[PDB]
Write a protein that binds this ligand. Structure first.
Ligand SMILES: CC(C)=CCc1cc(C(=O)O)ccc1O
Ligand SMILES: CC(C)=CCc1cc(C(=O)O)ccc1O
Ligand SMILES: CC(C)=CCc1cc(C(=O)O)ccc1O
Ligand SMILES: CC(C)=CCc1cc(C(=O)O)ccc1O
Ligand SMILES: [Fe+3]
Ligand SMILES: [Fe+3]
Ligand SMILES: [Fe+3]
Ligand SMILES: [Fe+3]
Lengths: 262, 255, 257, 256
């Protein structure tokens, strides 16, 4: 309505060639893993995965390889994985096939999505144990209002594609899904937006848990939550919100910063 | 016994001091983790010469890397950047400009989105005088008891400014904390202290049923520890600690 | 093919050098997590591969953050005397570890560190529920030691703990803290790391409300999938590597092969 | 009881000269402040104070000066303060006179005590709001069992009242305020402070999570005797001192 004008926010970049787009994505992919490591989302052993669709090779995805610590990962460590077979088509190492099954099915169900993020975190795990939608407790939780789901089954590791299919079906067109008794998944039209939604979702889980422990807080009414969610929950806002996180992660590691593509 | 805020002979010297302190305060807040909030956080500092214009951190610049040269000067009425190229967060700026207009005594307004501040703000409740450290807020802060989404209309900023009255802080319910100060330093101390007090209150409420300090004691304590002089002085080691962490920024310190 | 396998060594000397290096790095990993703040309380023992009933240990009072392979001491199981090195072990903690080692010839390493979440959860004298997938490795595979008699200054109290542990991967010493074991140091250190985080999650969820646990039959299946030695060993690898990357100086002490 | 023999633990050092003793104490004092800064106990503005009695000059105390951040302090920044007047007798800067009044009265009441520590912390502040003794919830809390008090009022006369309530104990909880510990050495005092804050953290979390069971008094008292002596506190602090040194090579070089 009285939202800022067209030129207020920065726009996601567009690239001439697939190779230029790919170099940009692999760098942002590595930086996002460094950002998540610094938040402590790298402690979960082999559980964490970020997939980014290759712009040129349909139905193949860049991924962090099994067991590589997020804190040291570089673009050259990323592997490209075939969606259907989960086989590595570029690189030597394998992906986490269970996590990858979930991601590939989400990617297949969501052609609009460039990136899927699933990391095992403390606040995310704890909140997921309630099998409950994230309430619109504060303005910052409103981007998820009427735009996330709870996957209300838990059948162990997703070793059958059918489990991935069921998760993707429950996600529908939403930005996030809570795997009950498991943890958070976010998606985005860009890696940047996906990584912002993940960061924000974990912080919202933290806030909700603490407020519930401390007393009986009041949530924002639906009508205001929905308005606020429209204001703050768009791809453009998510992409823009991620930028200082990317930049801050660069400033922290001069070595990674030097690998930024021309 | 206490140090006094400095006096300057020229606007240029005063301005350079303010911009340096402004950037260091952002580095202090980044180190506390208050830089995780995307585009939400804002600190405004009145320019000492140019009435009704305010230095601000620009939209999307990470607090951890910001320098004086990154700060933008923004016109209070239009929210237009009049010095620098980048834009301010116009929603947050609407709140700050209205508070500045309502409070000629205030040099600085701070609003950052934090975990403890967000959580506590969800209760729409004044911060109790639970410990000595919470007493600076006792009978000196308000709750803004409305939430209508982003503050995109100056009128909503006006309402917040009206509710703040002469107080040092206001809790925007279901949103987060705002503090003010006669100096940037005092404002940044109040913000730091308020977040810690929110943390302590939430933990104590979760753990059981704690007892507050009685109002009579709280008010006396609050007078002792809630003055501008105390707030300004309390901030000094925080400024210095932030400097020690970045030698590069430390070299940009004016004389 | 998919998972890596623990290494096999041709000589006791090569095995030993590998273990001491991994032992030091594990202590660096735990320091970084803040599990080094407990004064003298924390202990990791690693069985020597050649010398029966003797154990490498971190020495009393050496900070985890600076420890190197050369600082580790080898301790006799029965006497708790240092047989290699100069310094003494924490004899109370060692009594527990020696008895567990004696009871569990399959175990290479025993880990006991005093942590905030571990201590807090241990105050409830309660098994760790299968609240999330990550807690399932402990499902039907850990015990609670349901006595607390002070420092373990008698072998007999170590015996009681070892008896209650049975064949499990972990035991919660009530009003005290966590102990994990493993067929390798790596797996033991992964179980400890994971156990502490699971204690954290359980405490927060119980504080926040009334969460629902995974049903037993699903928990048991998940626990078999994620609770094997192979999975534990593999899960630890990025933690070892991340600790190395943090200290180039320690990283240079890595043995070859 | 079944406790280790004579030579098992290291002993606090003895010096032949006050000059050597003093240089040792000032170095340890600076390092302890670095240790506490790293724990985040430096966030509390002007609130935090560590006093260390000078070994030679009666009723005078080394202190961190008002408003110097803990993270950067060196031995040369410490000031020596007269107990009675709170005047700086060595150095230029002033101490926090309010906090110092509490410390000086504690020192006066406790000739056995070398060091008094009062820092404002999150878990300490929160737990102190309950005006309740720290229960023997885990082994680690047992050093405080029957060896700490709650000051059941609101903050020289105030210092006197605190010192009276502390009696011969290692710690006192200032209700609705925060923690104080003391020690026969700086090292032991700093260990008790570190440990006390962690114990407050554990107690708060366990009380939030449900209804935990404490160690019975008889076992708590035995455990407290095993782990709550000066010797054990001194020894427990040593890795914390050494770890703090390893973190700052620059401070490490100032070691006497
Ligand atoms: C067995 C396998 C293919 C992968 C291992 C693995 C997967 C996951 C997960 O997807 O949640 C979590 C932890 C973990 O270790
Ligand atoms: C639409 C717009 C002007 C600004 C962005 C923006 C503002 C705020 C806020 O003021 O609370 C929080 C997050 C955020 O992204
Ligand atoms: C008296 C003695 C042998 C050892 C010291 C000692 C042991 C323990 C323990 O095992 O839990 C914890 C702390 C500590 O200081
Ligand atoms: C007025 C004065 C001498 C000191 C100020 C001061 C005292 C205290 C305290 O004693 O608890 C805490 C914070 C603080 O800022
Ligand atoms: Fe998973
Ligand atoms: Fe805001
Ligand atoms: Fe122990
Ligand atoms: Fe105080």
């Amino acid at each position: 309505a009285n939202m800022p004008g067209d030129d207020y926010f920065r726009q996601p970049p567009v690239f001439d060639t697939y190779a230029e787009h790919r170099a940009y994505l692999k760098f942002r992919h590595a930086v996002a893993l460094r950002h998540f490591a610094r938040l402590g989302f790298d402690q979960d052993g082999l559980a964490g995965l970020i997939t980014v669709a290759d712009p040129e090779h349909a139905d193949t995805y860049w991924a962090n390889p099994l067991a590589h610590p997020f804190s040291t990962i570089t673009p050259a460590d990323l592997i490209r994985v075939d969606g259907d077979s989960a086989e590595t088509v570029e690189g030597q190492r394998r992906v986490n096939i269970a996590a990858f099954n979930i991601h590939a099915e989400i990617h297949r169900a969501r052609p609009d999505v460039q990136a899927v993020i699933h990391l095992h975190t403390v606040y995310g795990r704890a909140f997921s144990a309630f099998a409950r939608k994230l309430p619109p407790l504060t303005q910052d939780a409103c981007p998820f209002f009427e735009d996330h789901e709870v996957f209300d089954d838990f059948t162990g590791l997703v070793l059958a594609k059918d489990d991935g299919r069921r998760i993707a079906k429950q996600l529908r067109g939403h930005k996030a899904i809570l795997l009950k008794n498991h943890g958070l998944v976010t998606v985005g039209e860009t890696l940047d937006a996906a990584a912002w939604w993940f960061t924000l979702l974990d912080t919202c889980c933290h806030v909700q848990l603490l407020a519930d422990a401390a007393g009986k807080p009041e949530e924002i009414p639906a009508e205001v939550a929905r308005l606020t969610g429209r204001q703050l929950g768009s791809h453009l806002l998510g992409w823009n919100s991620y930028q200082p996180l990317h930049e801050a992660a660069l400033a922290r590691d001069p070595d990674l910063a030097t690998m930024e593509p021309a």
